Amino acid sequence: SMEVTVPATLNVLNGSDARLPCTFNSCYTVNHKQFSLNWTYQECNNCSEEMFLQFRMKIINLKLERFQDRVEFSGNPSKYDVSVMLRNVQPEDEGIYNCYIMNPPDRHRGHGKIHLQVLM
Amino acid sequence: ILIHSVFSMIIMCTILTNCVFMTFSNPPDWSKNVEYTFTGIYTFESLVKIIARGFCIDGFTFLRDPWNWLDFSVIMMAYITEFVNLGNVSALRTFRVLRALKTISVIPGLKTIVGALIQSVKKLSDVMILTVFCLSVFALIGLQLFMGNLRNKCVVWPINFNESYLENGTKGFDWEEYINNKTNFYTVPGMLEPLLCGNSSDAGQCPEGYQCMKAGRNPNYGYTSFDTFSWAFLALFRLMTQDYWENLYQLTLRAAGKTYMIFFVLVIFVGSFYLVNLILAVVAMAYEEQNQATLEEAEPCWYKFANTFLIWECHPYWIKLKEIVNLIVMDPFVDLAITICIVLNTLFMAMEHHPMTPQFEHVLAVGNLVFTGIFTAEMFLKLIAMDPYYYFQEGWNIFDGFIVSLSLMELSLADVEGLSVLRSFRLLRVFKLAKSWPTLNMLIKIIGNSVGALGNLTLVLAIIVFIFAVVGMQLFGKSYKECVCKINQDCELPRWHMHDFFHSFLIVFRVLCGEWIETMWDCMEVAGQAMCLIVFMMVMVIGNLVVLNLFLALLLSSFSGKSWWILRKTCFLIVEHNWFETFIIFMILLSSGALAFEDIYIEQRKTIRTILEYADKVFTYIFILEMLLKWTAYGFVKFFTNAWCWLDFLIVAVSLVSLIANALGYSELGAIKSLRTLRALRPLRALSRFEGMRVVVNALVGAIPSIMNVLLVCLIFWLIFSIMGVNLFAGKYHYCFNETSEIRFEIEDVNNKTECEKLMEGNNTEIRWKNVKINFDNVGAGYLALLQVATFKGWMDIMYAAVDSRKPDEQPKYEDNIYMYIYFVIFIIFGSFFTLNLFIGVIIDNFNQQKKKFGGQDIFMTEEQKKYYNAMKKLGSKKPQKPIPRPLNKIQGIVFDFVTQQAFDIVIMMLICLNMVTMMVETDTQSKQMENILYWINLVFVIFFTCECVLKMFALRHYYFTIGWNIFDFVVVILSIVGMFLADIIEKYFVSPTLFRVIRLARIGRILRLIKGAKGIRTLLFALMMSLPALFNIGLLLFLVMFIFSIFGMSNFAYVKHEAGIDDMFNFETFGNSMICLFQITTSAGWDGLLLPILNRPPDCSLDKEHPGSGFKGDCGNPSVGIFFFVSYIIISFLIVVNMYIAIILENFSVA
Amino acid sequence: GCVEVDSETEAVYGMTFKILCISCKRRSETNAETFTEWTFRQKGTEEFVKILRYENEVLQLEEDERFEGRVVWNGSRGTKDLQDLSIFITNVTYNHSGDYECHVYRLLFFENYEHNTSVVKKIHIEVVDKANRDMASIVSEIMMYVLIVVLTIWLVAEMIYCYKKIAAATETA
Ligand SMILES: *[C@@H]1O[C@H](CO)[C@@H](O[C@@H]2O[C@H](CO)[C@@H](O[C@@H]3O[C@H](CO)[C@@H](O)[C@H](O)[C@@H]3O)[C@H](O)[C@H]2NC(C)=O)[C@H](O)[C@H]1NC(C)=O
Ligand SMILES: *[C@@H]1O[C@H](CO)[C@@H](O[C@@H]2O[C@H](CO)[C@@H](O[C@@H]3O[C@H](CO)[C@@H](O)[C@H](O)[C@@H]3O)[C@H](O)[C@H]2NC(C)=O)[C@H](O)[C@H]1NC(C)=O
Ligand SMILES: *[C@@H]1O[C@H](CO)[C@@H](O[C@@H]2O[C@H](CO)[C@@H](O[C@@H]3O[C@H](CO)[C@@H](O)[C@H](O)[C@@H]3O)[C@H](O)[C@H]2NC(C)=O)[C@H](O)[C@H]1NC(C)=O
Ligand SMILES: *[C@@H]1O[C@H](CO)[C@@H](O[C@@H]2O[C@H](CO)[C@@H](O[C@@H]3O[C@H](CO)[C@@H](O)[C@H](O)[C@@H]3O)[C@H](O)[C@H]2NC(C)=O)[C@H](O)[C@H]1NC(C)=O
Ligand SMILES: *[C@@H]1O[C@H](CO)[C@@H](O[C@@H]2O[C@H](CO)[C@@H](O[C@@H]3O[C@H](CO)[C@@H](O)[C@H](O)[C@@H]3O)[C@H](O)[C@H]2NC(C)=O)[C@H](O)[C@H]1NC(C)=O
Ligand SMILES: *[C@@H]1O[C@H](CO)[C@@H](O)[C@H](O)[C@H]1NC(C)=O
Ligand SMILES: *[C@@H]1O[C@H](CO)[C@@H](O)[C@H](O)[C@H]1NC(C)=O
Ligand code: NA
Ligand code: NA
């Protein structure tokens, strides 16, 4: 894939704020309209994949039942931040976070894997 | 203490293995343990060196040796890297090149070479200072002239307010977004950068519906710019090295007009020729001094096997046969026979083509078989005639054995796939003539000295090229892959990148060749500006220094009644009259200048064409009268024994024949029409008339006889290389364009020629199977292509078509055959470097002998010029000038004291430096507040300088009009006052921004006072002034050659297709444009582009073009005369500019 | 391409004349769709009247008898980019005098930006009976002849003076 750095392992308190970033280093700093980025979450390793956030010429929150009004984006794609923030995490949120982006001026399509777990 | 030589040998093996591993681009994970082993070996050596006199404070420790510092540094950096470290992985990975740099320390003798480089650098410091200050002055000049002119682009002027959308869909109009929206520019179809335009009458022309506004980003990724001092300095440093300077020439002349070509001539003939010659001459002085300093400092078991097996004497019949065949060799008639066979073989392998009839290729095969059979027979007869042991004792015979064995291996392996480089090994047979030729033996001596007495130095050069190539590959490698689409619009790797090691070595070689800027731009656009600027400056300086030192070392090693009589004297008296000669020189000047007005703009000014045509008759009449009267004055035998008289008579006769044909009505005939273009030869009479040009041409003709043999050797060497190139590349230079998309078909749709012809029959001329038009298809085309490669112009296209070449009748594909790059590398190393060294050495010896012939005097100046030479030589000493004694006044005494301390001088120099840096800080689009600050600081500077000048005038006006530097101060300060007054009162009837810019340039003259306080720079400027007259004479000869070739361009290469290098500007359609092209070609820059559009054919042209406003038809010229025009000009220009180089270099040696 | 030359101002009665009007593109690179119209008026006559129109494939001439069967086109031949406007007159009469105006209408094509431009060039000719050779030719003839003869007299006088002086010098010895 492309150059993506993510926290290898993070622990979140019961119901506390969680912040999982997906930075990305390449040429052609991210613009607004033409740029395409995706965010998918998996409830387990071998379960089905459910996309929860997208940005096609505008930020699109799919508003899944797992992420009705909890996932929010307050990062900076220009500063290499497409992070997703999950407040009041649930034990069922234990799974995989995946950040998909694509840069129009370049031709590098890559992804990034993030592992999140919840402590009792 | 365990310092046995086997330790050095194993360290050598380990360091070469590490070098190879670094050469590997992506290290496989199974090599991590090998790298660990290498690290262990290095730390074992570190253990040895630390247990053998390790402690620093102790004397003679390894800390005293500088290279052990590098050893410890690389060990500590490896230890840091193998665990946690800083985030910049690329820099720490690059820091391992010290491992390869250790080869400098471990190999014996390299430290002396590095030291020698150090003394050369320490010697060239003064010339570096002068270069920096001269480049700064020229940078200020260019900054104040071409400020922001490089931005001038054709913006769509009829602002369409009704549909001027904003970025966010406002429907409103904002100015700053209209001037930067990239699709509001022209971008002429075919080129990449938007076309540059201009308001000036002679500048570039906007299309119908576009303006000439400055709009947006600078060309060539934004690095070609005069807007700020940094990019102006980059551009003028580029001009000094002449790297791709034709592009900057064209851009600036198209943006700011052709009238600024004076500036480029000034910078080329001052900062490009003179400064580079100065650097080279000073490095030569340093190396020669050190070289003579070195001269001052110098002041059983297998034998018994050989006697049995290597000797073939066993039976008396065989011994008798050996004696008989030894007699048969016939040594007096053996060398002649073998040389005749060798010449026949080489001129037989010369004839080679892509299209070969079966009979002709059969003849070549049979002839090569016969020749190799003769050479095998000669080898066998030599072996049987004289014992194999003593046969192989001669290195010449083992060379012949290698050649004959390689020849024999060919017939057995005649079906091997590829391996066309094997068939060219027979070319080395030509070297057998080196026994007869002493000069070919000299070439072999130079090649041997390259790897002989200077093998260590060439190894240093190889190590430098290696470490730079690996530094680039590890620093910018991943960057060239992440940022692919930033430099290449097709999102693929460019032709020249630093991803692989081979490409990195190619780019460092190119920087050594001279083309650094075109890749330095790309790597800036990819991986930052600072890193590329530092890396490329370092590699250029170091590589050029080492290559120049190697060249100089090789050059030094190679070096060591009664009415007829009365009427005759009346005619002699009238011809001898100096005023009469001035009159005839004026007449020849007018006749030569009359040819300038004959161009495409000749249907206009019909009165001018008629007047010039009718004055041609009177000019020819007066020249006929001159020829007749000179005949009468001298005599037929006296006149016809003079070459200049022959030239004059020839020109007069051909002009008279042209007039007779015109009077006979033969003007429209093809023969007389072709003879008409020979009218360009008229200015040659100036050779006979002007004394300086006559002296220079006499010197060149006198130098020719010692030069023909060297040119013959160079032709033979390039013939060997051209036969190699023809064998490698014959026929593999064919394309299949689809002109609508103008894309060369990739080899997956059409592969062979047959499939392209299937497209031909199915489609129409929209698909074309065409050649490169500069190719290896025969020895003549081989010479042309090798000339382009050795002149480093046009070599890009040839190399691209070569590395893409795969098979004689197959479509080329992108770098399937990349490794033929080494063929051009080897050609540049041997036939363009070593042959150049031989040529230069022979020229130096010839000129030394010629100077020693005429009592050590100059051979490029006339008698009056020699008197001027001697007068300035006498006047160059120290003159005890009067110290201007103190006046008889107290106030005048104190002001004289103030003006006489050195402190006053120091503060004035410092304030001039501050004014210069304030000139530096000016940039385009600078804030208006900064503009006002600069305005008032300039006003304060000018007022202060005026106050100083008037104070010194009140001090002693009459005796400060006595120094020339004071006069310079006076003129610059008063002209600055004039400039500021005109700035204040520009509101008049004569508003002229260009003259305003020039009078602001006039400010720059003040910083030239810095040379007054300098001594070495003053001496170098005095040397330039001292050698000026020879430059003047050679410049007149060069200008006259330019004039003749320009008229030839008018007559032949007008009305050619505007394809590449010939544009709406910089063409052969007008006198100004014609000498623009000729001066561009004079420095050999971009002559490939000028030559290319001639070489096309009516498939690529239209033999009947309308050409409005003229009866002339046809769209492109004759290829055969195009090649003869440009090749002959390059050779003539090359021979002339060398005399300029010799006049500068050799004069400097006599100074010191 | 850009060789713009005005037409000759004299036409001889009964012979042929080539009316010339060259308007070149500022950049030869650009491709344009051009078509023209020609307006004419006689001496002592009212406003101009159009006579011929050439639009990219053919020439249409007005039905006025002053030009029927005696005007042929010598411009660019069927290239859709005129760049060369030249009307040829056969059997020139006295009525073909006065003022001609060539109007050039261009539609330059660019990437996404058309442009319509009109250029008008005014040319005035007179019809005569004898081809009055221009003043340039006669003044050049006279100047060349007088310069030749003055050079001859100068050289002859110099030779005579030198001959006399050298004779006076050599008669002493
Ligand atoms: C530079 O100028 C050009 C020409 O004005 C700009 O291109 C034009 O951009 C506008 C809006 O940005 C496009 O209008 C759009 O048209 C579509 C239909 O295709 C419509 O659905 C939208 O609502 C909008 O009206 C217009 O088509 C387009 N024209 C061309 C030839 O590209 C360009 O955007 C400017 N550059 C920048 C960086 O703004
Ligand atoms: C695109 O961006 C531009 C500027 O970035 C926006 O222009 C702004 O448009 C608003 C809406 O009309 C303006 O506000 C009003 O302006 C009028 C002008 O007389 C004023 O009387 C009102 O009191 C009010 O302030 C605003 O001035 C104008 N400029 C700026 C700098 O905000 C434009 O609306 C944007 N378009 C879209 C579709 O986002
Ligand atoms: C080439 O010549 C022109 C005029 O002879 C130079 O000045 C340019 O003049 C036009 C008006 O004819 C200016 O356009 C206007 O600019 C203002 C600036 O704010 C803008 O608001 C208006 O909407 C309109 O576009 C144009 O700006 C002006 N050029 C500059 C650089 O200001 C022109 O500069 C000359 N080109 C050169 C010297 O490269
Ligand atoms: C050389 O490359 C050019 C690239 O433009 C090729 O021209 C293109 O050929 C295709 C053929 O399918 C054209 O498509 C056609 O377009 C018209 C108009 O839109 C449509 O009515 C047809 O049904 C068809 O789709 C395409 O327009 C044309 N491009 C241009 C700019 O004219 C050409 O075929 C290539 N030649 C060879 C020998 O490969
Ligand atoms: C360049 O020329 C060579 C020979 O002159 C071409 O080789 C021939 O290519 C054709 C089709 O590309 C082959 O025909 C096909 O062969 C396959 C087996 O490879 C077979 O299964 C098909 O039914 C069909 O017969 C032909 O066999 C082959 N010649 C030989 C001797 O194998 C080559 O294709 C040409 N390059 C092109 C057209 O780009
Ligand atoms: C813009 O369009 C309007 C139509 O309402 C027209 O009146 C006006 O003249 C146009 N202006 C320009 C510059 O095209
Ligand atoms: C161009 O302008 C002329 C002048 O009136 C007009 O007759 C013609 O129709 C215009 N053509 C286009 C394509 O705008
Ligand atoms: Na160049
Ligand atoms: Na080049």
Numbering used by the authors:
A (entry chain C): 29 to 148
B (entry chain B): 128 to 426, 721 to 981, 1181 to 1772
C (entry chain D): 20 to 192
What's written in the study?
Eukaryotic NaV channels are composed of a pore-forming α subunit and auxiliary β subunits. The four-domain α subunit exerts voltage sensing, gate opening, ion permeation, and inactivation.
After processing, the final reconstruction map from the best class of ~41 k particles was refined to an overall resolution of 3.4 Å. Superposition of the Domain I ECLs of NaV1.6EM and NaV1.7 shows that the ECLI of NaV1.6EM lacks the short α2 helix, but instead forms an extended hairpin-like turn. Importantly, the ECLI of NaV1.6EM exhibits more N-linked glycosylation modification sites than NaV1.7; N308-linked glycosylation site appears to be unique for NaV1.6 based on the sequence alignment. Consistently, the signature fast inactivation gate, Ile-Phe-Met motif (IFM-motif), binds tightly to its receptor site adjacent to the intracellular activation gate, resulting in a non-conductive activation gate constricted by A411, L977, I1464, and I1765 from the four S6 helices, respectively. The van der Waals diameter of the activation gate is less than 6 Å, suggesting that the gate is functionally closed. The second blob of density is located inside the SF, namely the Na2 site, which is about ~5.3 Å away from the Na1 site. Thus, we hypothesize that the Na2 may represent the second step for sodium conductance, that is, after captured and partially dehydrated in Na1 site, at least partially-dehydrated Na+ can fit into the Na2 site which is going to enter the narrowest asymmetric constriction site of the SF.
